[PDB]
Design a protein around this ligand. Sequence first.
Ligand SMILES: O=c1[nH]c(=O)c2nn[nH]c2[nH]1
Ligand SMILES: O=c1[nH]c(=O)c2nn[nH]c2[nH]1
Ligand SMILES: O=c1[nH]c(=O)c2nn[nH]c2[nH]1
Ligand SMILES: O=c1[nH]c(=O)c2nn[nH]c2[nH]1
Ligand code: NA
Ligand code: NA
Ligand code: NA
Ligand code: NA
Lengths: 295, 295, 295, 295
Amino acid sequence: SAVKAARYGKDNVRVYKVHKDEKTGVQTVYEMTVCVLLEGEIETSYTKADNSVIVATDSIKNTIYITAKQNPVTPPELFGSILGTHFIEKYNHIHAAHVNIVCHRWTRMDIDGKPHPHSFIRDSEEKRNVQVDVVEGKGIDIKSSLSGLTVLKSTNSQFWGFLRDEYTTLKETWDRILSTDVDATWQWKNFSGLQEVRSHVPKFDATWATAREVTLKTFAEDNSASVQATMYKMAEQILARQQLIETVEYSLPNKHYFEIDLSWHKGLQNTGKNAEVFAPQSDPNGLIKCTVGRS
Amino acid sequence: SAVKAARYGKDNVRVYKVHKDEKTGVQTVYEMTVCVLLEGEIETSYTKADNSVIVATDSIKNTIYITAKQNPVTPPELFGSILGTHFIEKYNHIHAAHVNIVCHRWTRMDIDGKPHPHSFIRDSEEKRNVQVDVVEGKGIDIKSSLSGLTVLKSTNSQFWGFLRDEYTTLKETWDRILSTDVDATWQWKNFSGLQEVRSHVPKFDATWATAREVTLKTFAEDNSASVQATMYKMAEQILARQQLIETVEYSLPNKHYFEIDLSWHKGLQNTGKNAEVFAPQSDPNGLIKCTVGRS
Amino acid sequence: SAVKAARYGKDNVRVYKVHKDEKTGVQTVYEMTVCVLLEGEIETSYTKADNSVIVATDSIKNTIYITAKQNPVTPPELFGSILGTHFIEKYNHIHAAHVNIVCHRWTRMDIDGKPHPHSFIRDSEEKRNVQVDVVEGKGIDIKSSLSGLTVLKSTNSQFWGFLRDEYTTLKETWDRILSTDVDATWQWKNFSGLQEVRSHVPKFDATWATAREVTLKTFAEDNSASVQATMYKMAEQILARQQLIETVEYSLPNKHYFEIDLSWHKGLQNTGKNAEVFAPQSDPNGLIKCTVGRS
Amino acid sequence: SAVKAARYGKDNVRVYKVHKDEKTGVQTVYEMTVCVLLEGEIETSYTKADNSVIVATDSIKNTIYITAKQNPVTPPELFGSILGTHFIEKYNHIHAAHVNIVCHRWTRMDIDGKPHPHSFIRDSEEKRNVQVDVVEGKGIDIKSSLSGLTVLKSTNSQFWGFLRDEYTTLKETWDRILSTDVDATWQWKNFSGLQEVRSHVPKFDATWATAREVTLKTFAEDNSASVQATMYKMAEQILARQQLIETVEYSLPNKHYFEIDLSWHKGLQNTGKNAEVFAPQSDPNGLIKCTVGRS
Ligand SMILES: O=c1[nH]c(=O)c2nn[nH]c2[nH]1
Ligand SMILES: O=c1[nH]c(=O)c2nn[nH]c2[nH]1
Ligand SMILES: O=c1[nH]c(=O)c2nn[nH]c2[nH]1
Ligand SMILES: O=c1[nH]c(=O)c2nn[nH]c2[nH]1
Ligand code: NA
Ligand code: NA
Ligand code: NA
Ligand code: NA
């Protein structure tokens, strides 16, 4: 037997950082969960009990805090690139670092219509994420994403004209509820190293904001022929607005809301045009994916 | 042996309702999870296998949908009172109904600064809840609550002057992070029945809004001497603003963020006045409760 | 306004303890999650920002570890009583302690048919719990429970003869699946203090074991007329076997498995006597409770 | 823009099946959660709103139940292969099916030392899983796994001799707790189609059983030099015992239990050789992975 692949490191490292403006008294907080996994010439720790090649996972944890102390933590694409680069430069025998960051929302509170200097609210479990792969001699690959964005529209969704055979019971419809949890990922062109990532810093927050806006607007305005058709429209627009993105991937559950036939009870009408009360279904759910790239 | 207490019914009944304004084209959605438990002369179903006294839990589920079809579902205090009253009036041998409702957020989307007519977003897992106990001959007891409101302030919290003995390691502090998940419940004066609940309908949404506002403002503005002292200020204000509330109860975790001493690494300064990077602690957590009533 | 009730302390304190037999080399592990909440003359911490009355929640955490170091942690009824008694005796102004303990399973591994001296497996998320209320001048009240015991029987459950009216669609049945998650609590007679709890130590593990055995056997062997009827049989037996128990409470979800009509597809028969494939339902669920005491 | 990849289908389809032996009266239950995602010539549903190419996800759900009705559901490697093959053969334009199955434990109850004919218990959340990829013209690729196997050993784990630099605070140790949740996957050699999968049916359950046994025994008996070294020993043995496996992958968290220094309190000794009470850490955790193949 032989080691074909190996990676190890520290997961679920929670980190908070505060920035204090002395001039204005305004404070800004950031909170993330970080995972760092390393690869390189470490096979002997598995095969020969040779720990001399192991940077302890405990040390990886220390490094994350030290790096957060000495560097900006935003945008997360930059912080992840700094963190991954550190490991491949510091250790001769480590050749790849894989950094995953989940950013948690702490939105400044408005009190009496004024932004509060140091109080924050968690408005939704929506996350902004990055995956950064730093590979020695091959640059920096960054995937940025948003996840946990939960939306619903109560009309202007249709689904008809699908394949019908002996397995099909689903009725065609011209008016249904559409609800999903959005997971959207945009993959950046490969960067040559940290200097190049730094050169594009302003694009990261702007592209996140654009991706979010395009997702929300398209969902709200499309008279949707299917999840497939609406998601493609979203991806097409993001690619048009940011030339440095190579691909956009969406993964969308179709969270079903079923009509409830109440006609057995005093002829009560609650289906089709008379449908008012529905039963949200926890499971099963449709799952629709697509990856869109350039011609 | 004897049956000392018994209750049974249906839990986790998910319900969605849409309202469609034909004049404006605007749609509004409501989504809840409902639990209904009944009590009454049902002991024989346990002791003698006498099912004749059982209103099937499946029928309770049907009733929830039918009731939602025929009545407004907002405010939830009203819907819960209608639902509970139904069971005690319809069935001679059922003498109490206990209705719990959790309301989920579906907030209308703003697209290009305009409210969208039929598209919604789940902005946070914060819930609005009610517990309604309808007891034959004793009226309607309603407890309203908000839960899952997660907040953090980065300064203007202190904790000093506590008891110190041989069990104490905690250092006094004049500047710390304070973060919590708010669970706040206000208990209404007993209502004589449905007519009286109907007479107070406008107070329900207004009092929820007030409770939320007072919680957020007091948290943001108090230079907090402790969780205990700040929560009492909140409760005092809610009681002052709504005479029909008898008691206010808060249950607050103290979600700790620990300083990280980095001085072992090149004398890096990250404690006290130099603290920038902290470690959020998943557990354990302080838990502080209080119930405030009128003199 | 006035403080009507207040309690505070530390929740989610995870504790592991190992016992090492030097003679045999055998090791035994215990892992728990502990919550301690205190009450007493502490109103001024809420109303006057008087922290001098507060035993810091951090100190409560320290106390839990120190107490676990100096005392046996099993049975949990004893450990909880020691822990609660500590607070009311040590602090003049603390008059009640409320201790909740959740015990996690670490079952010794069998390797080649022999019990291993120091290796353990988590066989199921079933928990053994205690709630201990220690109140100055009123003794020690203990509620013991098991929870998270998930069972299913594929036949020998019936449900017919229930009330039928205009809200009823459920068909009567003489053969169905019955599945539940068992939550069972037995409440001990009040104990005068720690000496009396110590005197009954052997009864705690024995009664837990009996409660579990009676639950499993009755579930498996009863040709069940309803959840109500089967649960009553369980409670009756536990009360008969342990005279020091005053009441037994069961809370049981009815986790539904629905038949799937497949007759639309080539006349496939999958209902009633031909039912083989079913759809487990995540929600809603029946919820049936009862508390049984002595005549 | 162009569609680079697309797949869609139904997730979270819960299925239960009962087998009834008429001769013995013994019943056996199976419960799974199934996901099926399809690929093929479906790009136009995304780009042109052409639903004619879509096999509705609702129909995929129906198919899963019908297939379970007409075929054995065990071993899951066989059921997944039957299910995936169905879609690529039935639909000309579907060229790949991806089937994921999670099998839930329902272990027959022992009542009075005898196996019960129709009563079952969920002994642990450990799962047995399969991933089956059926690709037209390329055969059947099967990955089998176990997950959610949670173990702990209280001694006979060491960790010393790792890299020490200016980022390192971890002390070397010759005696620590080791606890993990095992995720282990074995990948079968490619099969040419369903006939070949059928020919190897007895190997599936046997290899699962072997993988489990080797994992438990090696964990219990190895005087572990690191997670890395112990996991490699496991993988090596599985590959030696089943020639039809090509690779074995383990992914193991290192769930830390920290010593608690109590010496500040009356010189209490609770570290090193005197360590009895520990604090389990919820996060962060080490994460160690490896994939082992043949020379
Ligand atoms: O077994 C271990 N492997 C590791 O890589 C490691 N790093 N810190 N502690 C550890 N323990
Ligand atoms: O055992 C049951 N008890 C009940 O009260 C009930 N109601 N519907 N189905 C049921 N099954
Ligand atoms: O606000 C607080 N209240 C308390 O009771 C406490 N105990 N430790 N830290 C604390 N902070
Ligand atoms: O938008 C949808 N896409 C689908 O593929 C599908 N299948 N069933 N319902 C559906 N809705
Ligand atoms: Na390197
Ligand atoms: Na009545
Ligand atoms: Na006292
Ligand atoms: Na095909």
